[PDB]
């Protein structure tokens, strides 16, 4: 279904769940083990260099990643017999149950928020330690089972963090202000901002920053965040970003206690440190785990990190789509005796 799945005989009873033009997600049952799994089809990975490069990133990231709070790769396959008829491929991973977007209407006690956000940051510490930035953390990408176990999903926009990265990234409502203010020069803390936006949403049942376009998102953010002093204005390396700010609509900076009532002094403090405008003052994943807000649940022995840095050897290379296909096809077949 959009566009006609070609599964092996190992996976049976294809029930559909997600949909799109970039490919679909469907549930299936592995016939070897009896486990229920999630299968994601990449239907047009070779339409362009960018789609090909992203397909490669997603596969390798899924492949090399081993953490309780990050989705793992069970299998990957393609109906193709060679590079001559290689048009798409499928990723197989543990089935979950629901995601955080679906249950946002629920009422989240601070205990649940503590537990769930703690798992987000544990996974994020792991992902970041591999030198990777996710760049699309949102409630739809946070899988949750009946035990309130959490897994991070979707590495389609993820990559090895570099000094210069793709500009238009992250889903707008969860997109950090520096993505716009410091175009193409952000770091792993964009993920921390997304975590902040999510936590606030669990706390209220409402999306914190609902901008109508990429610029209005910035305006929404700078309402809660204050308009910075001349210290931060000169702390940037942009003249275009110096403007707009130069329109100085001022009243910095709101206090989160008055802005997030019926939430705990320390919960408000964590949101504040996560939603910090200045990227240097902003909490990292490792640091956020050490915040007093997570004391009832914290266990440093399960805050593991990557055993190996994620390889970025092709990241600074110029491949054709045909070359990307070769590497992808190669990485599909050597998996996983």
UniProtKB/Swiss-Prot annotation:
A motif (TXY) lies at residues 166-168. The modification Phosphoserine is found at residues 33, 336. The modification Phosphotyrosine is found at residue 168. Its EC number is 2.7.11.24. It comes from the Eukaryota. Its cofactor is Mg(2+). The modification Phosphothreonine is found at residue 166. It catalyses: L-seryl-[protein] + ATP = O-phospho-L-seryl-[protein] + ADP + H(+); L-threonyl-[protein] + ATP = O-phospho-L-threonyl-[protein] + ADP + H(+). GO terms for molecular function: ATP binding; MAP kinase activity; protein serine kinase activity; protein serine/threonine kinase activity. CDD domains: STKc_p38delta (cd07879). Keywords: ATP-binding, Cell cycle, Kinase, Nucleotide-binding, Phosphoprotein, Serine/threonine-protein kinase, Stress response, Transcription, Transcription regulation, Transferase. The TXY motif contains the threonine and tyrosine residues whose phosphorylation activates the MAP kinases. This is Mitogen-activated protein kinase 13. It comes from Homo sapiens (Human).
